[PDB]
Amino acid sequence: RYQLEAVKGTSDPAMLADTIAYHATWTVAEKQEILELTDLEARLKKVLGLLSRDLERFELDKRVAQRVKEQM
Amino acid sequence: RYQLEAVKGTSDPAMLADTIAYHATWTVAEKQEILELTDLEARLKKVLGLLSRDLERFELDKRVAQRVKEQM
Numbered sequence: 013r014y015q016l017e018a019v020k021g022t023s024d025p026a027m028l029a030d031t032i033a034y035h036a037t038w039t040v041a042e043k044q045e046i047l048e049l050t051d052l053e054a055r056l057k058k059v060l061g062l063l064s065r066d067l068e069r070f071e072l073d074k075r076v077a078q079r080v081k082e083q084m
Numbered sequence: 085r086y087q088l089e090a091v092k093g094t095s096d097p098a099m100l101a102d103t104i105a106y107h108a109t110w111t112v113a114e115k116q117e118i119l120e121l122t123d124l125e126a127r128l129k130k131v132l133g134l135l136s137r138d139l140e141r142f143e144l145d146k147r148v149a150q151r152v153k154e155q156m
Contacts, residue, residue, distance in 0.1 A: 061153055064153075
């Protein structure tokens with residue numbers, strides 16, 4: 013994650029969405045969609061919803077993991 | 085924001101009332117039934133009752149949008 017922290021001076025939002033949208037691997041084809049999109053706010057709210065479902069399933073994974081340890 | 089300039093310029097409230105009733109696009113028969121009523125009371129109450137309904141519809145569409153994004 014130093015690859016984002018060295019490009020903080022670039023304030024181009026569609027380019028940073030192409031960066032962070034690349035720096036998270038959910039699906040290569042939807043990253044091809046985002047990398048080829050014209051609109052910037054659409055790809056920004058898309059990456060927000062993707063990080064939403066990602067961190068939400070992370071927390072569901074932690075819930076199931078504690079469930080398993082307690083059943084142990 | 086150039087329709088708000090004709091309602092913030094002068095202080096005569098009848099001209100402001102008719103230009104707020106004109107800046108809200110509606111159906112022709114409702115405009116004729118507003119035209120049948122000579123006072124400003126019932127017609128501005130009708131415009132209020134429809135614009136508040138418009139506010140409810142926009143806020144309902146936004147709430148449905150956020151709940152659908154989280155649900156999906």
